[PDB]
Coordinates of C-alpha atoms in Angstrom, one line a residue:
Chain A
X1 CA 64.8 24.5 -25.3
X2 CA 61.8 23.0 -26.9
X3 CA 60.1 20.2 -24.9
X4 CA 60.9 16.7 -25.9
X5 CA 57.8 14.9 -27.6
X6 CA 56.5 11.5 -24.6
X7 CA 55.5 9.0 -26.4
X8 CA 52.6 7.0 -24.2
X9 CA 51.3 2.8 -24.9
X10 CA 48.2 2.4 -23.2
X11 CA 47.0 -0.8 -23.8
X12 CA 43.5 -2.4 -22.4
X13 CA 43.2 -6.2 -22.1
X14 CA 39.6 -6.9 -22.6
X15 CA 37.3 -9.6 -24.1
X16 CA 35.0 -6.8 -24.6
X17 CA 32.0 -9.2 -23.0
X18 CA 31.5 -7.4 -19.6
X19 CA 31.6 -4.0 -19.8
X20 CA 29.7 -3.5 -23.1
X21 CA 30.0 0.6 -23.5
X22 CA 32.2 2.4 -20.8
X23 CA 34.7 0.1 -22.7
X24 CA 36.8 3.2 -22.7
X25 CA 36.5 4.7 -19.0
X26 CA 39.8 3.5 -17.8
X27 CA 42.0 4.4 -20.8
X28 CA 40.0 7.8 -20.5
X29 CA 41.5 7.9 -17.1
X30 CA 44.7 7.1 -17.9
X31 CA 44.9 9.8 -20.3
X32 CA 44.2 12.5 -18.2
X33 CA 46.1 11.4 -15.5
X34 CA 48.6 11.2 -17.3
X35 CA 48.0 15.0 -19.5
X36 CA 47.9 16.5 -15.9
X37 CA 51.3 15.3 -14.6
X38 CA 53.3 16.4 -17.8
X39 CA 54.1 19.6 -19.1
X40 CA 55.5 17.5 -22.3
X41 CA 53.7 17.3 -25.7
X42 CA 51.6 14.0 -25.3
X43 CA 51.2 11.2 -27.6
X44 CA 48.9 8.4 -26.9
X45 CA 49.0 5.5 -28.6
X46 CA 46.0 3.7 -27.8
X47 CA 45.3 -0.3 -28.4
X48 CA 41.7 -2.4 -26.9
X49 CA 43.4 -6.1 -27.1
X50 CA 41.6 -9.3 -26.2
X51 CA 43.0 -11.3 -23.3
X52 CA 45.2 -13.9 -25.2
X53 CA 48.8 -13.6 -23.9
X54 CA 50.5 -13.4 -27.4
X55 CA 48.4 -10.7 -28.6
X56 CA 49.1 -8.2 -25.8
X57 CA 52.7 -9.0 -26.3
X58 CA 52.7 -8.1 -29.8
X59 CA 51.2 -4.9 -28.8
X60 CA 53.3 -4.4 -26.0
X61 CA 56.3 -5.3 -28.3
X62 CA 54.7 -2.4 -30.9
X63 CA 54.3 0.2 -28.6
X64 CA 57.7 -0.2 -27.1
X65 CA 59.1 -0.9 -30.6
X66 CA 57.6 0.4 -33.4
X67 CA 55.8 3.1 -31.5
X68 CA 59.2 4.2 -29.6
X69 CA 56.8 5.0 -26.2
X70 CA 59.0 5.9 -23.8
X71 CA 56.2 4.5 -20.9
X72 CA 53.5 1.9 -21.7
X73 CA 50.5 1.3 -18.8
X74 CA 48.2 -1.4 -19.7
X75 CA 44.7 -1.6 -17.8
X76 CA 42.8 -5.0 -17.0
X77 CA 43.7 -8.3 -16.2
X78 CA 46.4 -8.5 -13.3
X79 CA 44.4 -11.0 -10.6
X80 CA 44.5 -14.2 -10.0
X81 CA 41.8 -15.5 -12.6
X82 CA 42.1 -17.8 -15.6
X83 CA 42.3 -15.3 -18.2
X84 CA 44.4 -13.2 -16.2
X85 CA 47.4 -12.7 -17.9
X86 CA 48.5 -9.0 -18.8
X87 CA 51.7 -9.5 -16.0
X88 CA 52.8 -13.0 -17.7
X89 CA 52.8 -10.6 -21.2
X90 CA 54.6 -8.0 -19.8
X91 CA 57.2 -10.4 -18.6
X92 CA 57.4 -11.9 -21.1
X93 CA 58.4 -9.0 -23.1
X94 CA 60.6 -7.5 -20.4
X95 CA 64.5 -7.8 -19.9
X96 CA 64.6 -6.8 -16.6
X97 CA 61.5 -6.0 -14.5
X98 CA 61.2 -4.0 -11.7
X99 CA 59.7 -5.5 -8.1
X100 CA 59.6 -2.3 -6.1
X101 CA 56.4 -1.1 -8.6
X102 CA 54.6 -4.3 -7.8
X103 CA 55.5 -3.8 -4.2
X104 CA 54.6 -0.1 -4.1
X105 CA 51.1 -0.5 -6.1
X106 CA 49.7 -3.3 -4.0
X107 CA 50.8 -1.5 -0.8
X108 CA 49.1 1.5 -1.8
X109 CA 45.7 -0.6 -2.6
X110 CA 46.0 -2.3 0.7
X111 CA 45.3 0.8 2.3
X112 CA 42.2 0.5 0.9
X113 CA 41.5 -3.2 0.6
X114 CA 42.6 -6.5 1.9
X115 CA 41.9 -8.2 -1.0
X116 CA 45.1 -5.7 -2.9
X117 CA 47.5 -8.9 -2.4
X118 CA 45.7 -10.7 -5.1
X119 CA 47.2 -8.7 -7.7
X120 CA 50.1 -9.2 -9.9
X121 CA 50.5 -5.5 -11.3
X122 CA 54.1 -5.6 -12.2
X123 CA 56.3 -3.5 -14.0
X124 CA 59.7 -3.8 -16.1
X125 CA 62.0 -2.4 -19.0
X126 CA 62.2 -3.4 -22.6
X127 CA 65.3 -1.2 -24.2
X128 CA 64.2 2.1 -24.0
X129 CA 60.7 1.8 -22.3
X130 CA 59.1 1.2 -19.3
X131 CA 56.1 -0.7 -18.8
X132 CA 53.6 -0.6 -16.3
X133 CA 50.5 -2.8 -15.3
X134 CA 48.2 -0.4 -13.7
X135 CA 44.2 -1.3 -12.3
X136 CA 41.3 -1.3 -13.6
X137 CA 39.0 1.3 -12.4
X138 CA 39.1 5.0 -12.7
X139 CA 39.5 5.6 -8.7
X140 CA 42.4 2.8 -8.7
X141 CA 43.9 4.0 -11.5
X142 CA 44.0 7.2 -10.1
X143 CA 45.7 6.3 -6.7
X144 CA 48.1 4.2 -8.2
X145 CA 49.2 6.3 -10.7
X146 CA 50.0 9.2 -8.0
X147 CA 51.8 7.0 -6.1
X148 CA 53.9 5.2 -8.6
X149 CA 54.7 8.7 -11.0
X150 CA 57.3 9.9 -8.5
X151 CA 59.5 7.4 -9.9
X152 CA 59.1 7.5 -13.5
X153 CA 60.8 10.2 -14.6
X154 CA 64.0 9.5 -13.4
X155 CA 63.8 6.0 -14.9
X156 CA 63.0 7.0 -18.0
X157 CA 66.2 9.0 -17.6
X158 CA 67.9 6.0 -17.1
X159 CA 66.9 3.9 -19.4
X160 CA 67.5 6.4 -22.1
X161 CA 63.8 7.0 -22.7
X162 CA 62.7 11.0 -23.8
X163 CA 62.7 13.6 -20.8
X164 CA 59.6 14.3 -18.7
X165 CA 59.4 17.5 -17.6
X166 CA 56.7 17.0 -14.6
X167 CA 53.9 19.7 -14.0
X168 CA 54.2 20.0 -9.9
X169 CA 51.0 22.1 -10.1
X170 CA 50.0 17.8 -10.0
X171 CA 52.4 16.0 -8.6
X172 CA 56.1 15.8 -7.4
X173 CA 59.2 13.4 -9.3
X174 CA 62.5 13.4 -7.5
X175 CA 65.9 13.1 -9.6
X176 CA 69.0 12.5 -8.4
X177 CA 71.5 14.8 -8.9
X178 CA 75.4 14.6 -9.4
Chain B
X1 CA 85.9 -20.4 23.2
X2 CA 87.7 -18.4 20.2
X3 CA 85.3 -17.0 18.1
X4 CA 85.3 -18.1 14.4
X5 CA 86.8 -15.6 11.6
X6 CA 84.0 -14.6 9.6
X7 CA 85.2 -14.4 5.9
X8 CA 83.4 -11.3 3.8
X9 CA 83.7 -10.7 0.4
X10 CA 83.5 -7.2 -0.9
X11 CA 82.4 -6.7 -4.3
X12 CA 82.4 -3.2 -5.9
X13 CA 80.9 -3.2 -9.6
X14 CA 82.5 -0.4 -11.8
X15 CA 89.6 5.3 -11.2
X16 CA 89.2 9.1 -10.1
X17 CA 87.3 8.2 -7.0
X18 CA 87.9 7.0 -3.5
X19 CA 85.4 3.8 -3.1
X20 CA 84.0 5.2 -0.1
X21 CA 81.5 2.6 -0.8
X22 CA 83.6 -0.1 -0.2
X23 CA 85.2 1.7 2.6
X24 CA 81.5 2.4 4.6
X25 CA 80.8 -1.5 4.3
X26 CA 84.0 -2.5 6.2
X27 CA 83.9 0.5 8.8
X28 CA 79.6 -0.9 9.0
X29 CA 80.6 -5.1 9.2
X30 CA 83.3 -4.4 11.8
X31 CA 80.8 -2.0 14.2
X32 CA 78.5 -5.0 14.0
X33 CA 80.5 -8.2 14.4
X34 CA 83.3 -8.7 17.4
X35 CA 84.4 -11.5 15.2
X36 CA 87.7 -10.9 14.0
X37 CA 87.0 -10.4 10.2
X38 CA 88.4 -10.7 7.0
X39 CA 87.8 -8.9 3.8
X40 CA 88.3 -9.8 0.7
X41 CA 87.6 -6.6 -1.4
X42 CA 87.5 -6.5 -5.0
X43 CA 87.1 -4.2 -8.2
X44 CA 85.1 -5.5 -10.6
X45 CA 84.0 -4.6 -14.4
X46 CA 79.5 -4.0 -15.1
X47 CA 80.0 -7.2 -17.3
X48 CA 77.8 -9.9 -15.9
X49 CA 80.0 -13.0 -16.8
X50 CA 83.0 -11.0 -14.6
X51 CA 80.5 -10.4 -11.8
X52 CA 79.4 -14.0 -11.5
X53 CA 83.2 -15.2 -11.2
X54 CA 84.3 -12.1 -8.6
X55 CA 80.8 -13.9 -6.8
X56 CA 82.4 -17.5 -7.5
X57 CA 85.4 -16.8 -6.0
X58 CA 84.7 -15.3 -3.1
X59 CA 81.8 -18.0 -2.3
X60 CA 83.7 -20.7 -3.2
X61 CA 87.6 -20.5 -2.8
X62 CA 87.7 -17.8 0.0
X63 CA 84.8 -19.3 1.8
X64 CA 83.3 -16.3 2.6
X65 CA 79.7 -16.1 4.8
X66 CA 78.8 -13.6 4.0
X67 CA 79.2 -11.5 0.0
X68 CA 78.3 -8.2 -0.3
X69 CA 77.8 -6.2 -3.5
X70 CA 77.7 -2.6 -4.1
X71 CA 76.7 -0.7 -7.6
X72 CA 74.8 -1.6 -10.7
X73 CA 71.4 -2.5 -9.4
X74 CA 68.8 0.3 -11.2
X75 CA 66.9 -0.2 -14.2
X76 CA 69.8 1.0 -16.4
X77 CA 71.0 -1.0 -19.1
X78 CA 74.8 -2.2 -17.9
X79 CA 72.9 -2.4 -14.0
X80 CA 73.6 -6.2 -14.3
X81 CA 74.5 -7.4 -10.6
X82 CA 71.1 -8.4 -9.5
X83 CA 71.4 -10.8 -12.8
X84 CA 74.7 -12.4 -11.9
X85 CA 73.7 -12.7 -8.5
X86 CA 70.7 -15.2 -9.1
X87 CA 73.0 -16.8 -11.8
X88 CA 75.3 -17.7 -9.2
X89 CA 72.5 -18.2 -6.2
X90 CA 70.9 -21.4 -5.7
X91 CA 67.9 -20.2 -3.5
X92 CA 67.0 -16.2 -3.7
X93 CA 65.2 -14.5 -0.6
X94 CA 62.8 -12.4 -1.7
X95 CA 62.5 -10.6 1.7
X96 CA 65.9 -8.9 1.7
X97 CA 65.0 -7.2 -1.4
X98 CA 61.4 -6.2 0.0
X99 CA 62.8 -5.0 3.3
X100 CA 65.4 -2.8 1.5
X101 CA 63.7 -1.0 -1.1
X102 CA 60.8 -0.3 2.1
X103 CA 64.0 1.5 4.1
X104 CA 65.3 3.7 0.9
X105 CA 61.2 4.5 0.2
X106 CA 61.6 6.5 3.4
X107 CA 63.8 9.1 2.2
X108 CA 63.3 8.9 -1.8
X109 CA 60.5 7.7 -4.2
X110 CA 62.8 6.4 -6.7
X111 CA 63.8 3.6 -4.0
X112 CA 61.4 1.0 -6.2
X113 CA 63.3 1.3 -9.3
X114 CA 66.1 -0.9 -7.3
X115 CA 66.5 -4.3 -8.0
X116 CA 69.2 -5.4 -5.2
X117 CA 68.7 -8.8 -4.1
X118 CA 70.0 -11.3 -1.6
X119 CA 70.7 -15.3 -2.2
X120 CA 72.3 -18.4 -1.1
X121 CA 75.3 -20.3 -2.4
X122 CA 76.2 -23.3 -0.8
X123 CA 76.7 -21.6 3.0
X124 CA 77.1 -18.2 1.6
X125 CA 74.7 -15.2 1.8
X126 CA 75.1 -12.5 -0.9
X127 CA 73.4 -9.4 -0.6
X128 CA 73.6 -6.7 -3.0
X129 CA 73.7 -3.1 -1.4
X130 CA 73.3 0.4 -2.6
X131 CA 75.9 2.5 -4.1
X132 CA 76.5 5.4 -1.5
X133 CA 77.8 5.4 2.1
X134 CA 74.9 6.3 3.6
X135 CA 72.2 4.9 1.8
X136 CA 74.9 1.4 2.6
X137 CA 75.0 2.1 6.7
X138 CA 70.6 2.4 6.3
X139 CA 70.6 -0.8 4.3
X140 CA 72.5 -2.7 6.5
X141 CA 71.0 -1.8 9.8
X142 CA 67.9 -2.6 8.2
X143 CA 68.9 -6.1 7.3
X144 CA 72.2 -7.0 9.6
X145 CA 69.6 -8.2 12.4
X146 CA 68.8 -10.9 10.4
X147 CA 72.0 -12.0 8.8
X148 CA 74.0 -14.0 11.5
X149 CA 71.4 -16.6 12.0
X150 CA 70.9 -16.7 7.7
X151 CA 74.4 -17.7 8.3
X152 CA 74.2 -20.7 10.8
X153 CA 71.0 -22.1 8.6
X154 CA 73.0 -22.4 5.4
X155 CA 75.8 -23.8 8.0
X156 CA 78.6 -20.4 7.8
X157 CA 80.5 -19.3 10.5
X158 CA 78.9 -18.1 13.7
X159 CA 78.7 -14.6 14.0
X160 CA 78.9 -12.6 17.1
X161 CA 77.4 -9.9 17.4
X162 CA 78.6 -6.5 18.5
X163 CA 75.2 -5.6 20.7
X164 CA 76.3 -1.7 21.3
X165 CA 75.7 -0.9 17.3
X166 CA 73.1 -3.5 16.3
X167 CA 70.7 -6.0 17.7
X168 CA 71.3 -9.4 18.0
X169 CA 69.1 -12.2 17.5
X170 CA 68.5 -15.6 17.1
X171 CA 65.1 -17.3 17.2
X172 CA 64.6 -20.1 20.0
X173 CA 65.9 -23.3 19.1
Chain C
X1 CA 20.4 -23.5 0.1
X2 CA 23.4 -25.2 1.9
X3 CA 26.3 -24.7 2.2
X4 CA 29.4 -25.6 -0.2
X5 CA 31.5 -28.2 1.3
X6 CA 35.0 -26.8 1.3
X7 CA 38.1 -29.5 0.3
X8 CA 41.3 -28.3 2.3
X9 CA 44.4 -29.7 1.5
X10 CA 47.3 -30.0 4.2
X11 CA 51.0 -30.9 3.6
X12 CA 53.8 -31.3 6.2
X13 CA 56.9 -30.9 4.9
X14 CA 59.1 -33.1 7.8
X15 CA 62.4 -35.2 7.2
X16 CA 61.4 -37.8 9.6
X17 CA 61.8 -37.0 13.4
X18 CA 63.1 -34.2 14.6
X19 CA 59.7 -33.5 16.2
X20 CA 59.8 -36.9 18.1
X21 CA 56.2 -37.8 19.1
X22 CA 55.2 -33.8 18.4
X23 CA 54.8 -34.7 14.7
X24 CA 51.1 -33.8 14.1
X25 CA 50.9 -30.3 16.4
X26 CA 50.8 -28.1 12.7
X27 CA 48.2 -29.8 10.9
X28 CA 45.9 -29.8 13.9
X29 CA 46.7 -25.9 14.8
X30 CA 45.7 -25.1 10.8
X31 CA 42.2 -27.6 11.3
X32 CA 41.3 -25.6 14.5
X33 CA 42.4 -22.0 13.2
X34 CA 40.5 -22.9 9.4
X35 CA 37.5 -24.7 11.5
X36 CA 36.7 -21.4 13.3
X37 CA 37.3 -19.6 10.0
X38 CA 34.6 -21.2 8.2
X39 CA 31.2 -21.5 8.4
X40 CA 31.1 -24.7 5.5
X41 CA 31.2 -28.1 6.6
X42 CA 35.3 -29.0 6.0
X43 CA 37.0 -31.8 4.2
X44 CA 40.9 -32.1 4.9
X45 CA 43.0 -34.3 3.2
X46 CA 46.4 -34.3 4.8
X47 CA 49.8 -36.3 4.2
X48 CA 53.0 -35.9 5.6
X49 CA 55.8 -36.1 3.4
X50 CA 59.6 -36.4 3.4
X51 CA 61.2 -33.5 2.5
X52 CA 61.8 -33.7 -1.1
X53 CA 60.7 -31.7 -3.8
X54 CA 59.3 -34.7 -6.4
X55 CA 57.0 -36.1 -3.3
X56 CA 55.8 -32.7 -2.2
X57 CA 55.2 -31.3 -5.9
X58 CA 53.2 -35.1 -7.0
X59 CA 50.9 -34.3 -3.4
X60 CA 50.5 -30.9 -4.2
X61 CA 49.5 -32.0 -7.4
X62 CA 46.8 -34.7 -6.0
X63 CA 44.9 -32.6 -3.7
X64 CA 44.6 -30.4 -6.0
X65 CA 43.5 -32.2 -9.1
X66 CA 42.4 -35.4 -7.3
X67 CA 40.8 -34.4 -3.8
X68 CA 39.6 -31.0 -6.2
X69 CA 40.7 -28.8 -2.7
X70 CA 40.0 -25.4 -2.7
X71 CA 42.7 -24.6 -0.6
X72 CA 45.6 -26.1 0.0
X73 CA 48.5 -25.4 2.6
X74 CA 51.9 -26.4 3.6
X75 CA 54.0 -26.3 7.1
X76 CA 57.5 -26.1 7.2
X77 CA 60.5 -26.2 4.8
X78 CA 60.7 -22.4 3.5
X79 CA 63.7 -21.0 4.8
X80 CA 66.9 -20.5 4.2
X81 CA 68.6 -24.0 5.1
X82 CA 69.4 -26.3 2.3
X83 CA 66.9 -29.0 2.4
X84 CA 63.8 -26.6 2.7
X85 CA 62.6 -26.8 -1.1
X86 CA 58.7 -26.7 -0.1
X87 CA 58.6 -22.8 -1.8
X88 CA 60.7 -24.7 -5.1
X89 CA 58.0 -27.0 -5.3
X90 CA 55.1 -24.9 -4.5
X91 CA 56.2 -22.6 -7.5
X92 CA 56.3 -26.1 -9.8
X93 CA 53.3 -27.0 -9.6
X94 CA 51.5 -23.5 -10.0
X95 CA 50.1 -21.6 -12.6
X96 CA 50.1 -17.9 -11.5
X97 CA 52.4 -16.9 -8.3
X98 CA 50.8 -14.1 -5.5
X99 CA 53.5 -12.7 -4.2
X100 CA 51.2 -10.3 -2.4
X101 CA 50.8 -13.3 -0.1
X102 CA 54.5 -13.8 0.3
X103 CA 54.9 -9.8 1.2
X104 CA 52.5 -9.6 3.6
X105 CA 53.2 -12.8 5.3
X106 CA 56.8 -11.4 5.9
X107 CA 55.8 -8.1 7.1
X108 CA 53.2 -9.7 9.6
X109 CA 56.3 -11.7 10.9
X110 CA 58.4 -8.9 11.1
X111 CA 56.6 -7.4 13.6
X112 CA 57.4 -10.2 15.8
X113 CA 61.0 -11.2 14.5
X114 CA 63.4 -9.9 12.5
X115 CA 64.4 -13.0 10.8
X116 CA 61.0 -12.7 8.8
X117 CA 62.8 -12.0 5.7
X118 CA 64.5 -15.1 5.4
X119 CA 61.2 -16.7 4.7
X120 CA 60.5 -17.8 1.1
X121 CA 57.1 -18.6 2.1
X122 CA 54.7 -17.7 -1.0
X123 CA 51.6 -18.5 -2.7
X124 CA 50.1 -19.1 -6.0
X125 CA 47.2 -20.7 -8.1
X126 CA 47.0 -24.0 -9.9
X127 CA 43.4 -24.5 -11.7
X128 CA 40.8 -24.0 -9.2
X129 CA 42.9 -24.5 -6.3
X130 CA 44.8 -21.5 -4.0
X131 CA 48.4 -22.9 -2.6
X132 CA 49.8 -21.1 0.3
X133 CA 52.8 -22.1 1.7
X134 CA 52.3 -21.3 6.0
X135 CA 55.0 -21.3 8.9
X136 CA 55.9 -24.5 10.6
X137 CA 54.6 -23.7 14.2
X138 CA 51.1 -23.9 15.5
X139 CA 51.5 -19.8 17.0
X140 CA 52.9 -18.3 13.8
X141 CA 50.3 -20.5 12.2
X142 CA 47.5 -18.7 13.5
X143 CA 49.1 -16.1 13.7
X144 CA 49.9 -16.2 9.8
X145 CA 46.5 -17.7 8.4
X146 CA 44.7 -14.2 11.0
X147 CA 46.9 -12.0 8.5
X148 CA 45.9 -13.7 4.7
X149 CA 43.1 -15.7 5.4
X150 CA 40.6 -11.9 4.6
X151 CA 41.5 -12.1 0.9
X152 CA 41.1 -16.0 0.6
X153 CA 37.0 -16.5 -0.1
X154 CA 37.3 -13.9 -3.0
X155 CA 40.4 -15.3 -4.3
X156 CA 38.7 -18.9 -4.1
X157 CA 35.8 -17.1 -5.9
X158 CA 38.0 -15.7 -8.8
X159 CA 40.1 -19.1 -9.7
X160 CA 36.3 -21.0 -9.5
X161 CA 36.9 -22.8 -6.3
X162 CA 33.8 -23.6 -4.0
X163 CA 32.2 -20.4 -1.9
X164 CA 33.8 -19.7 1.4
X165 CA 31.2 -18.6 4.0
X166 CA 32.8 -16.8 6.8
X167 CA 32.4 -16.9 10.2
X168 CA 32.2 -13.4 10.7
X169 CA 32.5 -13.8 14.2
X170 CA 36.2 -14.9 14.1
X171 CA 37.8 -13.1 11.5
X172 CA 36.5 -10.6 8.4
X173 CA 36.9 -11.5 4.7
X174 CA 36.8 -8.9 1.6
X175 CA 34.3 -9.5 -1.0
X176 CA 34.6 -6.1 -3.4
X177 CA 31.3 -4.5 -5.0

């Protein structure tokens, strides 16, 4: 009856020449986020990597992999700029990805604003794990995360991933019975 | 003055159990269309190679308009119909997909971890459906409005629909 | 200072005549609609082209890297039928797809017409240059480029392309803190 150990990438893209310190604020927020929605024992495994697409999928590829997370998040580097190019990693390293997260995260930010359809926040499976593109900020990462962690659970179920067992003190995940 | 028999193909990926899958799409298609209809229903193996002949066949040698699918669309490992269906699809239509996960997201969060899909082959339209009878009669009224004049651009059949149970329409011309 | 001059490129997609002598209604609706839009003095650099894929993806390709346009659109072409490949191309000669763009220009349709989600109308980035793939007539234009056109300066802004100055007036565009 013991809780299953989650195992949790979070990976930051950055060139780390912009922020300076604070270099850490978004992972931060991930973490607890992410600590308040599960009643599991948490893991974090926790990569900065520089935005040059092979690099983030080797650590993508390590997480998943070596690492056996059962979710990666990655923070940074989903608009339409040159150097943008977390989602072409995480395709990349994908077998099947996973359109309704994309859909659901930029819908969610276009509450907010118009400029959310510049995004390319995406999400997919690789064996066991699933990985998600989430924002950059705090506040976004936030929002996005409460809208998009109804749904994880249950695929992590079926994708053979570890069992979350959710803390609804934070937040609600529907499963499917039968 | 005869209306045209619309061909549909029936395609249920997956012996204990009544398909009532299969059964809710026929009982849905035939409230919809006052064609007279015919189905060509088959069983079919979660092995993508199997999937894109069943697809083939039905597209190609039965001449069907329109395909639908029903089962093996999640994020699960053997889910592989989305995959066969862009194998066999020249063009894809991203707004089926879109329009169908937004209906399921009424009633259940989990709705985005669906990857059904809809496509063209040749002057077929295959869409691929959920696995339940209900969650199949919400899918389709969501995206039947929309399907009869998919089928006279890619040059099928012409369609008429059954006004009482669904809305017709076709944009001016 | 000034103001940037903005490079727009326009592309109809048309196999020939089945317009008759209607053939240049889009391109003139997207000049007006783009001309109240913008503040900047406007180059356009249109063609016409016959609908297939090699000719639209090589004058994609020159506004873009020859007439250096900022934005570039298309009419027509995006649905369903077999000989509308303007999306196919579109997607060639990119970089980067949005498909928020493609999203939201379906659901803005869909208010009006249920046969929005057979469009395959999308958008994506090639160098300094936003491609975006618009309806074929002049009322859906507008009524397409009122729905997108908000998140087009800063998107212009992020892939380096010249700065949009909008005439706030006629419709609102998004620049984030």
């Amino acid at each position: 009856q013991g809780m299953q150990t989650i195992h949790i990438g979070v990976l930051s893209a950055s060139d780390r020449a912009s922020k300076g310190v604070y270099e850490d604020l978004s992972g931060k927020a991930i973490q607890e986020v992410l600590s308040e929605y599960l009643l599991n024992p948490l893991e974090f495994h926790y990569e900065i990597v520089a935005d040059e697409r092979d690099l983030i999928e080797k650590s993508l590829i390590k997480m998943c992999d070596e690492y056996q997370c059962d979710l990666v998040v990655t923070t940074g580097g989903t608009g339409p700029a040159l150097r943008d190019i977390t989602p072409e990693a995480t395709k990349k390293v994908c077998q099947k990805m996973l359109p309704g997260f994309g859909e659901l995260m930029r819908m969610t930010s276009l509450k907010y604003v118009p400029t959310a359809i510049l995004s390319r926040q995406s999400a997919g499976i690789r064996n066991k794990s699933l990985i998600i593109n989430l924002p950059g900020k705090p506040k976004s990462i936030r929002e996005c995360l409460e809208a998009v962690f109804p749904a994880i659970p249950y695929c992590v179920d079926l994708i053979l991933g570890n069992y979350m067992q959710v803390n609804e003190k934070n937040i609600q995940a529907f499963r499917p019975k039968q």
